[PDB]
């Protein structure tokens, strides 16, 4: 069954950009799914999205412009200590200036670029090139 | 690996089909794996069809035809020249 709603959402976006689609639909829209797209919009990997109200966790339409390379979820969210960031950057990211991790912290959803500044850790949701 | 995509037979959604007996050697072969040919032949061959009409007690008698369905297996289906070995890219022909 649907174990991780975020996992099925991200693979839909990754597959859509590999086919050159202009906008894709994700039927469920949790809080983290919308929050994850907000992290990818500050980096300008997507232009904008929308949240159709269907009374059953309505769909999301993501507007993308050939910029997202690989957005993926991470299997059960590992506890990322602040000192452990360097372990994951060197593996999950292509280069020290390109990739962007996504983490969940008590102060809200944050990316690796800003969560280091906020001086906090927590679980990890995924990444995107 | 797989010389054929459908493994020679022609069954997809069923796990068993009743056996039939080959018409030449009498070898138990499945219904779909068998080679089915339908033969229509007049009992009187063309070399003798006009011989009957010269001396026939009837007036407008039309000679009937024999209706037999022959099923062969691969062992004597190929040996009987019913089917032959085809090219690798010519195997997919199904007409």
């Amino acid at each position: 069954v649907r174990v991780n709603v975020l996992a099925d959402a991200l693979k839909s976006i990754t597959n859509a950009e590999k086919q050159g689609k202009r906008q894709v639909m994700i039927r469920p829209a949790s809080k983290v799914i919308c929050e994850f797209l907000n992290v990818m919009m500050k980096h300008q990997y997507i232009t904008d999205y929308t949240v159709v109200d269907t009374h059953r966790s309505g769909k999301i339409v993501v507007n993308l412009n050939g910029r997202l390379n690989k957005c993926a979820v991470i299997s059960p969210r590992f506890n990322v200590t602040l000192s452990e960031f360097d372990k994951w950057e060197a593996n999950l990211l292509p280069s020290r200036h390109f990739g962007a991790l996504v983490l969940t912290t008590s102060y809200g959803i944050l990316d690796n670029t800003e969560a280091r500044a906020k001086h906090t850790g927590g679980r990890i949701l995924g990444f995107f090139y | 690996t797989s010389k054929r995509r459908n493994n020679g037979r022609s069954k997809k959604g069923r796990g068993h089909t009743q056996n039939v007996r080959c018409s030449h050697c009498g070898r138990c072969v499945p219904k779909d794996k068998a080679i089915k040919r339908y033969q229509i032949k007049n009992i009187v061959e063309a070399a003798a069809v006009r011989d009957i009409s010269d001396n026939s007690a009837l007036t407008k008698y039309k000679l009937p035809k024999t209706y037999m369905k022959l099923e062969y297996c691969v062992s004597c289906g190929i040996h009987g020249r019913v089917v032959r070995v085809r090219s690798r890219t010519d195997r997919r022909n199904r007409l």
Binding site: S75, P76, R77, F78 | -
Partner: protein, 106 residues
């Protein structure tokens, strides 16, 4: 078995799946101390009993001079390869001969 709380299945799987290698398993079975004539020893001292010559395998030809040596710690019989050319003469009957493995491990 990727789940965060499933750290017992993964560990138990590796404990089960580690026994199938031919190399490390030799390091946990009690056979080195039992069936290996050398045991865990580098060298084995023995006594000469018989002089024997083993012919080579199919592609090659010739007779390889060898000696059947009986150990002093286990008493087992092992065939030993006399090292050099014409060196079978140097060895004698009932003398201390050192036996130490071969190139291939064990």
């Amino acid at each position: 078995a990727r789940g965060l709380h499933a750290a017992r299945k993964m560990l138990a799987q590796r404990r089960a799946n580690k026994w199938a290698d031919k190399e490390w398993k030799k390091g946990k079975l009690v056979t080195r101390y039992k069936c290996n004539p050398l045991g865990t020893a580098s060298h084995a001292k023995g006594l000469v009993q018989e002089k024997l010559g083993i012919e080579t395998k199919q592609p090659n030809s010739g007779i390889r001079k060898c000696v059947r040596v009986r150990l002093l710690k286990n008493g087992k019989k092992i065939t030993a390869f006399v090292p050099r050319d014409g060196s079978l003469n140097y060895v004698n009957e009932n003398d201390e001969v050192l036996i130490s493995g071969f190139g291939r491990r064990g």
